[PDB]
Amino acid sequence: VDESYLTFGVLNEKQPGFSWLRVAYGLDPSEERMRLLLHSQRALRNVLLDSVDFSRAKSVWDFGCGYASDIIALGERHSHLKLHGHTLSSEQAELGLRKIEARGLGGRVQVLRRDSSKDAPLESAYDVILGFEVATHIKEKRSLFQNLSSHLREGGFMLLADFIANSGSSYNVTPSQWVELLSEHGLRLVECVDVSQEVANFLFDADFDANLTQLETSVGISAIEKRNYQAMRNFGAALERKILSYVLFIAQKDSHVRSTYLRHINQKWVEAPAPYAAREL
Amino acid sequence: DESYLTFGVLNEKQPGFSWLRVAYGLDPSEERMRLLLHSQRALRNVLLDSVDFSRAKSVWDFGCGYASDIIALGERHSHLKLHGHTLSSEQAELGLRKIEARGLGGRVQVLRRDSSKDAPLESAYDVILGFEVATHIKEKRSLFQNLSSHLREGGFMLLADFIANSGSSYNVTPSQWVELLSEHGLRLVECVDVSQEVANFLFDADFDANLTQLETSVGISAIEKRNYQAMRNFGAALERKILSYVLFIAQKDSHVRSTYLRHINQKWVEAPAPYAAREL
Ligand SMILES: Nc1ncnc2c1ncn2[C@@H]1O[C@H](CSCC[C@H](N)C(=O)O)[C@@H](O)[C@H]1O
Ligand SMILES: Nc1ncnc2c1ncn2[C@@H]1O[C@H](CSCC[C@H](N)C(=O)O)[C@@H](O)[C@H]1O
Secondary structure: OOHHHHOOOOOOOOOOOOOHHHHHOOOOOOHHHHHHHHHHHHHHHHHHHOOEOHHHOOEEEEOOOOOOHHHHHHHHHOOOOEEEEEEOOHHHHHHHHHHHHHOOOOOOEEEEEOOOOOOOOOOOOEEEEEEEOOHHHOOOHHHHHHHHHHOEEEEEEEEEEEEEEOOOOOOOOOHHHHHHHHHOOOEEEEEEEEOHHHHHHHHOOOOHHHHHHHHHHHOOOOHHHHHHHHHHHHHHHHHHOOOEEEEEEEEEEOOOEOHHHHHHHHHHHHHOOEEHHHHOO | OOHHHOOOOOOOOOOOOOHHHHHOOOOOOHHHHHHHHHHHHHHHHHHHOOEOHHHOOEEEEOOOOOOHHHHHHHHHOOOOEEEEEEOOHHHHHHHHHHHHHOOOOOOEEEEEOOOOOOOOOOOOEEEEEEEOOHHHOOOHHHHHHHHHHOEEEEEEEEEEEEEEOOOOOOOOOHHHHHHHHHOOOEEEEEEEEOHHHHHHHHOOOOHHHHHHHHHHHOOOOHHHHHHHHHHHHHHHHHHOOOEEEEEEEEEEOOOEOHHHHHHHHHHHHHOOEEHHHHOO
């Protein structure tokens, strides 16, 4: 199944009997729940992507692109965009480019095996940088943000979805560390959107352990898929207990704001993010 | 002198403080003079502290009064070109003479130009200042067209001005502020609500008696007298929440999606940072 089916989504309330695993893998045949799965995932992505006028962008860098679903989708939407993805695995890189060529996106959309904490991307600067749950999988976050910010056009967007570690316990990063990573690299938050409870809702499955075994024995999954799914369940429990938050960061490269003020406005958004529920709907 | 007559922010009302008595030295208290000046600087610095002026080349103050603000910025940052617009000739002459006394000539200029219509000197500025100017201008869409088109991409627009709430200078509702900014590609970084703190600064239970004492002791112009009465009335309106007084920190942004730009401008106009909660 496509990797986009296995990403987080936002649910406004828990849906009794909804299992993200069963639905994604079609063990639950309901076309209505399949629609809800996809809608919840697009709704999460669109909080970030809807901020950017892509008609004024030339290039996008997804610095941990998985199987390149996100940049393939953007590429089919916006025929003029160069989109470049980075991944650490050769499997994802080969499978991504096979998808890219199957859709005829070979000129504009590329996937490279490059370590975004160290390796420069293809362009000297990008108009948009995407990182959906990438940064907290990277140990050397300062080197990463040095690399991202130096390849972000002035006024360009950095769109992140990632975890914040609260008074509690993957490399998890506290609010101050997020403020310092953004502020010291000239990245100014336009908005932070807190989707913690809605992602917890999406991930909630009272039958997770039994559904995972049914997936193992019926469909067959890899050791790495199984462990990722167990980690996702655990993330949902952490979000419910508010040990972690899951936050959508809309930031821009800004070399002209004063550093003391930049810290202030980044603190405002990390510490008082817009709650997803109050924000729209 | 003219800086002394601007709004300031007071965190609480101060019994016996009269902004008029203090500004004109009828109240001789040295401590109250320093409070007046501190309150006025604190209001201005909420806006000015957002900008790294070392990375700016040029500033446009589109209603500069007697040019006190751009003169002060010019003496702080020796490399800046600063251009002021005013509608009045005595304004421009007095400003230009004050600029020349400081040796700021050439670098700091004041022109008699109508900012709602007339282009400024530079094709684009890094910072645009407007402290209580926009609501004195009738043709606001023309004005914001003129300001935005002469604002460098990513440059700052720093405004201090009123918002008309359910209630009654041309006063502009929250939706009109959102539309003026959004339709001209101006994105709010922050709005700071200083309504009650400016109300505190303006509060003078003896205003009418103090104004007469000013008229009869010092002597003031018809223009000044009316301005001071209007300031007292603004304070009363702010106390009643008929108007708000808000500090807008905005930037030119051609790359944000228009629907999202309206959303984030609404966020800040409708839920500005309260000055009291904002710093400690
Ligand atoms: N240091 C690093 N440099 C480049 N890519 C990295 C990286 N660390 C992790 N990644 C990549 O980032 C991804 C982290 S999980 C994110 C998957 C992707 N966002 C999706 O929706 O499918 C993985 O694909 C991994 O290959
Ligand atoms: N349409 C217009 N174009 C240029 N200047 C204008 C204007 N309308 C008003 N002004 C100027 O804006 C000022 C209005 S109030 C003065 C604000 C001043 N910056 C201060 O706080 O001290 C006056 O100086 C007036 O000359």
